[PDB]
Design a protein around this nucleic acid. Structure first.
Ligand code: MG
Length: 851
RNA sequence: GUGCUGGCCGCUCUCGCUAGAGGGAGGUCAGAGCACAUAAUAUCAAUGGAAUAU
DNA sequence: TATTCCATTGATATTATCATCTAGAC
DNA sequence: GTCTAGATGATATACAGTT
């Protein structure tokens, strides 16, 4: 009902409504706001003031003192009510009596089946079984186990229940009624049970969300403080002193600034540098200790200082939440409210008994929808259809497969434009077989034996590489117990390829022009930027820029006029591209990504151009625009990419992906480029789309999955001029391979290996511990260097990278030497040989295999 | 059902004019295939522009 | 190279998406 | 009967270069 079901949702537009629906909705929202605000004060939370960006705050003690005045003598009852409501679950399903005026308490506990079977089996149960059964139930725990034994022995179950039922009644079910009579709580409709139930559960949801957020926030602050306090060295003190000195000159620190300043301080300089204040401060005697520090220590000190600066920036408490926006109001079938669903020829009719009827329209998402009524649920059957708004289009209509789901609740919500929407959250049912093998077997370093015994004897698996160009590179294989082949699945057996590595979709013809357009936009931006500077000091623009600007036909020759001619020409081309791609439905995804990049650049060009007249000293801030067209196009592209991958892999069980990193902090130089791929949300969408078809997804370690040889495990050199080719040197021969089919193959190799074989590490964690225990004798070992950089593990080095190439560990230097050897060999234009990874003459894939 | 496109004409703004470029609302003429898990709250990091300094 | 102000975007955590007894009715 | 509405319901699946 909940363990093996997958929830999804979609909306229907409410065309019209009868009865007093709007009054009911408005009353619910107003009471939600009021009582959420009140119960936030009953639970004395600290919070930061919103008006001054959290400079000041209200301590928990002041909130506690104000609560003592607000509640008075009901102080203790409210605390118990709040504890029960915050814990949640079934023991708190009777809190709606805080609002309901006609609430009546039953004086006996419910005769549930779990207690029927307990009482009916008292005769045969020994004392140890009895005490172990009732040590977790708070109702049954009200009676000692020995008394249970005498009751079972001397009395019949029919009279046992009568003797016991009043004794084990839950005494926290009457707390709300105690508060309402004592504080005079009144809601808008105190004689409607469903109204009170819905209101209480919505308010409780909001308060529980804030409770969990608040506690994790207060925990994380202390965690950060302890982590800062555990790392204290001399370099940290020196870096703190250096950072303070720079802030007095309004300069501030950075990793590049510190590193390059230390680099440039040793060498005497003549020409002034971009980082000159830092260099001048670094040449002072009091920072001599920074100039002789080792790189690892300097990096660690910088990291600790960065953590300290982030820690000092946090507020004391989170903001008080804003309750003003509307909530989705849920109504169900066993008590929350009452609704009936009727699918008609042209409408969907939702019947709320005494709050009117809602008439809704049909979707193409819920195509050919039918609903069948069952005792406490609806069975939904529908399909997806193409929406073609053009009446006479040449596209042949398509229809998807059937979908069967279970519906038990509905939601109602109002959009800010004044339209009402009905949400239908349904649940799909699939076997939890594929999702448990992915989480318990393939994500574990050492799976337990009973997991291994339950695995099937055959599997189909896949792997894929995702990039900004040639978006997807997939590979499909089949593994099984008792099979033979090049692929070795750890703890499971062997397997052989089904569909070798390839590139699913190459880039389109229009990708070349969409880069020239962005180059032109950036060049115009530079022209504007230097025109302003030359205007300020009464100089003249350089001849190169004037020659470039004069290439477009213009009605004048002054620079401002030439820059405006260039901007008009550049947007005539962007609009043409947008129109042409929208005409076809955005067939190519790489072209769409390039178009998005060009549009983003053009927006900055316009923003710069609008401020082309400002005078020194005066600032101009950004102006708010209520535009959401870019966010709806960017989202459409991510969903379309997730669909291509899931459509390719529709017959697999497990799919392997590398866990990519999202945009980074200020120290990264290319995080504007990775915001455009935007990888983490793409992975989320891929997981959601695979999960709708009962396919498991695993994320494997990514370091070195683009540098090892899939066949022999040797390192290669990836060309800098062209990133789509990688070169290897084996058997005194030079070989070349595609660097996207190498990534997919290495991802498949690491997935089948549970990511235990490392690419590089420091002289541990579960993966490295298992690798050390299996490849070598034991996990408690030390390392000594030998020969020309090879390492021998013995049962010394500290803090050094060690790489695994070809089955042996090697030191950092030998890895550099091998890559350099390949580089010098290729620089001499030595002809290489093409190797295909889908060859059927390959006898073993040795990449990331330690056994 | 939700989402994503241009040309042309007035009006109205900001900037410039040896000269035009851009924004907003509206009218009109066209274009239009393939995706869809729906919400509330909180928190962190960056992107772009402008001014300032070595 | 750095600082400050605006508005917008990527990402990650919480809260959610009912079942079964009982008392009245008719 | 069988409805249909209100008050009450045992505990709990990993790991740490890449775009
Ligand atoms: Mg790649």
């Amino acid at each position: 009902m909940k363990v093996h079901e997958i929830p999804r949702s979609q909306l229907l537009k409410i065309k019209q409504y009868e009865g007093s629906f709007v009054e009911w909705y408005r009353d619910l929202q107003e009471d939600r706001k009021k009582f959420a605000s009140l119960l936030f004060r009953w639970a004395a939370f600290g919070y930061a003031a919103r008006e001054d960006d959290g400079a000041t705050y209200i301590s928990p003690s002041q909130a506690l003192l104000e609560r003592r005045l607000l509640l008075g003598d009901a102080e203790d009852v409210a605390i118990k009510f709040l504890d029960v409501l915050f814990k949640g679950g079934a023991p708190s399903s009777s809190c709606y009596s805080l609002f309901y005026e006609d609430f009546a308490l039953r004086d006996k506990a419910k005769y549930s089946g779990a207690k029927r079977e307990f009482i009916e089996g008292l005769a045969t149960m020994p004392l140890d079984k009895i005490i172990e059964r009732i040590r977790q139930d708070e109702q049954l725990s009200k009676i000692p186990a020995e008394e249970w034994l005498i009751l079972g022995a001397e009395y019949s179950p029919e009279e046992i229940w009568e003797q016991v039922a009043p004794r084990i009644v839950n005494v926290d079910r009457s707390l709300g009624k105690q508060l309402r009579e004592r504080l005079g709580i009144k809601c808008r409709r105190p004689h409607d049970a469903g109204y009170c139930k819905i209101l209480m559960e919505v308010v409780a949801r909001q308060l529980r969300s804030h409770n969990e957020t608040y506690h994790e926030y207060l925990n994380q602050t202390h965690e950060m403080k302890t982590k800062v306090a555990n790392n204290l060295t001399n370099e940290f003190d020196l870096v703190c002193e250096f950072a303070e000195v720079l802030e007095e000159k309004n300069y501030g620190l950075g990793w590049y600034v510190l590193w390059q300043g230390v680099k440039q301080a040793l060498k005497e300089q003549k020409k002034p540098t971009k980082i000159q204040i830092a260099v001048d401060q670094l040449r002072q005697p009091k920072f001599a200790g920074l100039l002789t520090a080792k790189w690892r220590a300097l990096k660690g000190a910088y990291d600790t200082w960065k953590l300290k600066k982030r820690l000092e920036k946090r507020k004391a408490f989170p903001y008080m939440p804003n309750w003003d926006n509307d909530y989705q109001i849920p109504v169900g079938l066993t008590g929350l409210g009452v609704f009936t669903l009727e699918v008609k020829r042209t409408e969907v009719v939702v019947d709320l008994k005494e709050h009117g009827k809602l008439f809704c329209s049909h979707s193409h998402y819920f195509g050919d929808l039918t609903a069948e009524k069952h005792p406490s649920r609806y069975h939904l059957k529908f399909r997806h259809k193409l929406k073609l708004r053009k009446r006479d289009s040449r596209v042949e209509p398509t229809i998807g497969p059937w979908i069967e789901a279970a519906l038990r609740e509905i939601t109602i919500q109002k959009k800010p434009n004044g339209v009402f929407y009905l949400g239908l959250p349904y649940a799909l049912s699939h076997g939890i077989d594929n999702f448990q093998i992915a989480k318990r077997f393939f994500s574990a370093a050492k799976p337990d034996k009973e997991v291994i015994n339950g695995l099937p004897s055959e599997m189909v698996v896949g792997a894929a590489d995702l990039n900004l160009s040639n978006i997807v590179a997939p590979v499909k294989a089949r593994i099984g117990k008792g099979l033979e082949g090049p692929l070795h699945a750890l703890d499971y057996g062997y397997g052989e390829l089904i569909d070798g590595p390839k590139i699913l979709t190459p880039d389109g013809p229009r990708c070349g022009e969409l880069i020239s357009l962005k180059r032109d936009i950036v060049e115009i931006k530079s022209a504007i930027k230097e025109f302003k500077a030359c205007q300020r000091e009464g100089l003249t623009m350089s001849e190169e820029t004037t020659t470039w600007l004069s290439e477009v036909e213009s009605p004048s020759d002054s620079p401002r006029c030439m820059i405006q001619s260039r901007i008009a020409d550049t947007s005539r081309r962007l609009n043409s591209f947008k129109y042409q791609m929208n005409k076809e439905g955005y067939q190519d995804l790489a072209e769409a990504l390039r178009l998005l990049d060009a549009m983003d650049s053009y927006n900055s060009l316009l923003e710069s151009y609008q401020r082309m007249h400002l005078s020194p000293g005066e600032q101009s801030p950004k102006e708010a625009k209520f535009d959401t067209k870019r966010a709806s196009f960017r989202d459409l592209l991510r969903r379309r990419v997730a669909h291509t991958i899931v459509e390719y892999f529709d017959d697999c069980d497990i799919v392997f992906f590398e866990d990519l990193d999202g945009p980074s902090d200020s120290d990264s130089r290319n995080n504007a480029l990775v915001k455009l791929l935007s990888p983490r949300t793409l992975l989320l969408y891929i997981r959601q789309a695979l999960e709708k078809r009962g396919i498991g997804m695993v994320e494997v370690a990514k370091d070195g999955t683009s540098q090892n040889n899939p066949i022999s495990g040797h390192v290669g050199w990836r060309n800098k001029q062209n990133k789509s080719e990688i070169y290897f040197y084996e058997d005194k021969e030079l070989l070349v391979m595609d660097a996207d089919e190498v990534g997919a193959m290495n991802i498949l190799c690491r997935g089948l290996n549970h990511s235990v074989c490392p690419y590089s590490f420091v002289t541990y964690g579960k993966r490295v511990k298992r690798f050390l225990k299996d490849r070598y004798g034991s996990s408690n070992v030390r390392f000594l260097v030998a020969s020309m950089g090879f390492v021998t593990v013995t049962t010394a080095l500290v803090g050094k990278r060690l790489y695994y190439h070809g089955g042996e560990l090697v030191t950092h230097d030998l890895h550099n030497r091998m890559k350099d050897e390949i580089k010098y060999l290729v620089e001499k234009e030595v002809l290489a040989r093409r190797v295909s990874l889908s060859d059927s003459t390959i006898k073993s894939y040795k990449s990331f295999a330690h056994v």
